[PDB]
Amino acid sequence: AVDFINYHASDVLETSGWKSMVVSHPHLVAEAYRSLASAQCPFLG
Amino acid sequence: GPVAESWCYTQIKVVKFSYMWTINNFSFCREEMGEVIKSSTFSSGANDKLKWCLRVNPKGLDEESKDYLSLYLLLVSCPKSEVRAKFKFSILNAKGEETKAMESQRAYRFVQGKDWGFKKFIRRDFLLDEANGLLPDDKLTLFCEVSVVQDSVNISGQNTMNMVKVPECRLADELGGLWENSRFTDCCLCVAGQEFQAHKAILAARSPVFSAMFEHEMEESKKNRVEINDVEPEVFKEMMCFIYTGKAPNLDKMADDLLAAADKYALERLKVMCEDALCSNLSVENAAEILILADLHSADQLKTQAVDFINYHASDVLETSGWKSMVVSHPHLVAEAYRSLASAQCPF
Amino acid sequence: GPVAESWCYTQIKVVKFSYMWTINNFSFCREEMGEVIKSSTFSSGANDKLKWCLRVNPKGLDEESKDYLSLYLLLVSCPKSEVRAKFKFSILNAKGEETKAMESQRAYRFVQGKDWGFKKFIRRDFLLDEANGLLPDDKLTLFCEVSVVQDSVNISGQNTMNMVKVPECRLADELGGLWENSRFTDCCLCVAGQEFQAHKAILAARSPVFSAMFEHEMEESKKNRVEINDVEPEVFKEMMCFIYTGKAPNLDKMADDLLAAADKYALERLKVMCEDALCSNLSVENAAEILILADLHSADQLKTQAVDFINYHASDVLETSGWKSMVVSHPHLVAEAYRSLASAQCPFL
Known part of the structure; x- marks a missing residue:
């Protein structure tokens, strides 16, 4: 699910569930950021 | 020659x-x-x-x-x-x-x-x-x-000729003379018990917060004495020397609290200068603290540059304990970091 | 790399x-x-x-x-x-x-x-x-x-551009605005019926002459109703604008009386700026009154430049009536012009 959200982040962030997990489960989005940044990149700049 | x-x-x-x-x-x-x-x-x-x-x-x-x-x-x-x-x-x-x-x-x-x-x-x-x-x-x-290349320009700075001079601008220095010599002020402020004296006109002209403090509910009853009990005098004097002279020498050494003081007193130029001092000191071990300060004190350009720096150096900021503290205390900052990183890593 | x-x-x-x-x-x-x-x-x-x-x-x-x-x-x-x-x-x-x-x-x-x-x-x-x-x-x-293989795609990102731009020092602009808005005024000046209003600290710092009648325990008497009778109100307002802002916008058209007010009020910046304004006005007919005014108001650079101009262009100055007035009423001015002309710009013969 984390990888699916990372792949479809441009549309996922608009949903209400994402906006609710932002409030309710902060370390979940922290894991999302970690697996988007640490598990990818460098991407030029 | x-x-x-x-x-x-x-x-x-x-x-x-x-x-x-x-x-x-x-x-x-x-x-x-x-x-x-x-x-x-x-x-x-x-x-x-x-x-x-x-x-x-x-x-x-x-x-x-x-x-x-x-x-x-x-x-x-x-x-x-x-x-x-x-x-x-x-x-x-x-x-x-x-x-x-x-x-x-x-x-x-x-x-x-x-x-x-x-x-x-x-x-x-x-x-x-x-x-x-x-x-x-x-x-x-x-x-x-x-x-x-463009079309060139000629300065035509023909020297000598008129030999009359202009005596620069001593306004700032002789305004600092109103602060160092203290030169018969109008109000007494108070910095956690310590005594400082200041006028009212310059504070009002360069500080909308001070003007709103000074004219409303103050000029009738407590016009003489005011107590600023939220900032340390070692940076309050630097703030009151930016207010008078239009410049702050000892800024980079104590820009951590000078930004908070400047944002408290709406000093836009001093706030931007403090943002410059903190932006020039960006490092991976304190970027979470810098972003914390830049969101708490409503900085925008400093917050944007801290966000970009964290996007660049997200490899090792994660290991630092400050990022863990910002995760536990300010989730929305991490969410904004994810949002900016989403546009950064958009095509993949 | x-x-x-x-x-x-x-x-x-x-x-x-x-x-x-x-x-x-x-x-x-x-x-x-x-x-x-x-x-x-x-x-x-x-x-x-x-x-x-x-x-x-x-x-x-x-x-x-x-x-x-x-x-x-x-x-x-x-x-x-x-x-x-x-x-x-x-x-x-x-x-x-x-x-x-x-x-x-x-x-x-x-x-x-x-x-x-x-x-x-x-x-x-x-x-x-x-x-x-x-x-x-x-x-x-x-x-x-x-x-x-699919299509190529290009991401087009720019690297480190800006460091954070700093707003310019607005001390002069805000002090000029403080003069205009007259906020928390502490004194009331008088000029030819006009009752201007201004502060005390800035004036007594910029002008030692105002400090003279401000520091001598004349506050309750003179700060409230300080009287000035010499300067005309427009020139006085321009002088106050120079004091508060450090700038003289329309200095060129009033070079005489503004110099007079500056010499009265010991403003050794507006005085020299008025001298600069008068220097680029030296025609062959008004240099006499330029020298008279410079001598009266004790200006150095303006007087020396006018003396040089008169030594240069005396071929018409003695014909103009202003030099005759100088000869009649100001003997010392003609003497000093002769003293400059003596050991300069003529000793070859």
Whole structure:
């Protein structure tokens, strides 16, 4: 699910569930950021 | 060294763009001779209406250039009629150094949709050979620089002549004389018990917060004495020396609390200067703290640069304990970092 | 690797299929040359709309091949117009490592119904030899790898541009606005009936003359109703604007009286600026009154420049009536002009 959200982040962030997990489960989005940044990149700049 | 009655100065204006073109899986060139791979339009801040682009022909423009990759520069957008400029191309090797860097001797004239480049740029075999290192990880790293000349301007700074002088601007220094000598102030403030004296006019003129404090509910009853019990005097005096003199010497040493004081008292220029001091001290071990401060004290440019720095150096900021603290205390900051990183890593 | 101010990233997207193809009891090909044994259609996850299949002739497709195995790849459905790809075939041996791998160097195009392949893929006797073991238990295993190139895409990001721009020092602008808005005023000046209003600290700092009648315990009496009778109100307002702002906008048109007010009020910046304004007004007829005013208001640079101008242009100055007035009323001015003319710009004769 984390990888699916990372792949479809441009549309996922608009949903209400994402906006609710932002409030309710902060370390979940922290894991999302970690697996988007640490598990990818460098991407030029 | 002679002494000249007159001197003149002719300066020709030169603007330098820099550009870095990296092409992935170039050996999958996807086509035969006659293929054109263009780049994105690029420009700098000035004047930002001069748009340039690259056009590479991997096989070659013509039958003479079959074993020659050709590299051309094309000016797509230009407001004026003519632009005279001189270009230099290079390729970064696996270490990253420039190789086969050839320049143009001339400043060619460019117009809307005119291209000038090297057809005979580099041998196809010399590029394709792995031992040269010129295709590291099948990635073609061009790097181009263009210098555009403009019409020159003459200063005509004829010296001597009128010998009357202007006595600079002592306003700031003699305003600091109202602070150091203290020169018969009008109100007494108080910094956690310590005594400071200040006027009212300068504080009101340069501080809307101080003016709103001073005129409403204060000029009738407590006009003389006010107590600022939220900032330390070691930075409050620096704040009151920025207020008087229009400049702060000891700013970079104590910019951590001076930003908070400046944002508390709405001092926009002092706030931006504190943002500059903190932005110039960005580091991976404290970037979470910097972002915490820049969101707490409503800074915008400092917060934006901290966000960008964390995006750049997210490899090791994660290990630092400060990021863990910002995760546990300010989730929305991490969410905004994810949001910015989403646009950063958008196509993947 | 130096730092670049801007960059681009050309990304030609490539996907890779991986496919296996096992035929049981291959020696029972059951038929002669020309025959074709298609494989089940296969794809990958994305885009999954491109459908590929393998077509093998166990005997020769052509009269030139005959004792040859021939392998083709065929695209049966394409959502796009054409798709470019590179393919590599291999026959798996008894252990399972890839043997006899032949690939196409070019990125061939493909439409629906067009096939590309190797007719001269592998010698039939080489395949049917048991010692090399390319046919274990009468099983033929083909491993085919297909790489499709897509469109290029460019990301166009700019590197480190700005450090944080600082707003300009607005002390002069805000102090001029403080003079205009007259906020928390502490004093009321008088000029020819006009009652201006201004502060105390800034005035007593900029002008020692105001400090003289401000510091001598004359606050309750004189700060409230301080009287000035010399300067006309417009020139006085311009002088107050110079005090508060440090700027004199319309200095050029009032160079005389503004110099007079500056000399009265010991402003040793507006005074010299008025001197500068008067210096670039030195015609052959008004230099006499320029010298008179400079002498009266004790200006140095202006007086010296006017004396030099008179020594230069005396051929008309003595004819003009102003010099005669100077001769009549100001003997010391003519004496000082003679003293400058004495040991300068004439001692050759």
